[PDB]
């Protein structure tokens, strides 16, 4: 009885909280994805540098997979 009411009341307070801070969350996300991309690029640079290459493989450009490509 009170367990769905509490899920409902808890879920109600989260949707209200998300609405109040919707714009802040958007800027948080765009920055979390940018860090997620830099971490991806750096992890790829580590690989070729460890292998002994001084420059990335010819004709290679790290794909931007977290940007608004779709």
């Amino acid at each position: 009885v009170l367990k769905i009411r509490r899920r409902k009341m808890n879920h109600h307070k989260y949707r209200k909280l998300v609405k109040r801070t919707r714009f802040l969350r958007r800027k948080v996300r765009e920055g979390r994805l940018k860090k997620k991309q830099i971490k991806f690029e750096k992890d790829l640079k580590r690989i070729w540098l460890k292998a002994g290459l001084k420059e990335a493989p010819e004709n290679w450009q790290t794909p931007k997979i977290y940007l608004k490509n779709k």
């Binding site: 991806f40 992890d43 690989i47 292998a51 290459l53 990335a56 790290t62 997979i65």
Partner: protein, 176 residues
């Protein structure tokens, strides 16, 4: 397409062996009992029988793995023709994918039991069999991009080694 398609003048499987015995039959009667005045289901019973003769040693038996595989190839090619017109039919798209997977399961059992029959069945039916991969590979944009660089990085490192070996050997040859 496939090498053999039943002609429109062929009789249905019920009267395939009966009309030849009859001494004289009218052209109209032959046309009524031909494949022109029958449903597509009837034309598929003729395609299957033709393939059973050309592959199975004993076409009388239809419960063999080789015969069951032949039954599913006719259905699979039938579902494919259906899906070429009914592009948004999701029940038949499911029927096609489940029969393909069923044929693979049967080809696996046949390979494990009678390899000689397995090889003929695949060659005649034109079905390529790929063995199940030992490990499942996950797929997503981050993995496919890192896996492409890793292959590229390796190739570049090996190409450099080959060039160094040639130059090192060339210098040694000149000294000799």
């Amino acid at each position: 397409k496939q090498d053999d398609e039943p002609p429109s003048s062929a009789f249905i499987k019920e009267y395939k062996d009966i009309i030849p015995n009859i001494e004289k039959v009218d052209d109209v009667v032959k046309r009524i009992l031909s494949l022109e005045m029958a449903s597509r289901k009837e034309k598929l019973k003729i395609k299957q029988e033709q393939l059973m003769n050309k592959i199975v040693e004993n076409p009388e038996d239809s419960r063999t793995l080789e015969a069951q595989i032949i039954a599913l190839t006719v259905r699979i090619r039938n579902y494919e023709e259906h899906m070429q017109k009914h592009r948004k039919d999701k029940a038949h798209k499911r029927h096609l994918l489940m029969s393909i997977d069923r044929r693979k399961k049967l080809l696996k059992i046949l390979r494990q039991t009678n390899y000689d029959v397995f090889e003929k069945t695949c060659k005649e039916l034109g079905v390529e069999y790929t063995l199940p991969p030992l490990h499942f590979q996950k797929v997503h944009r981050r993995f496919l991009a890192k896996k492409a660089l890793c292959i590229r990085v390796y190739q570049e490192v090996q190409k450099l080694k080959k060039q160094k070996r040639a130059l090192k050997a060339a210098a040694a040859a000149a000294k000799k």
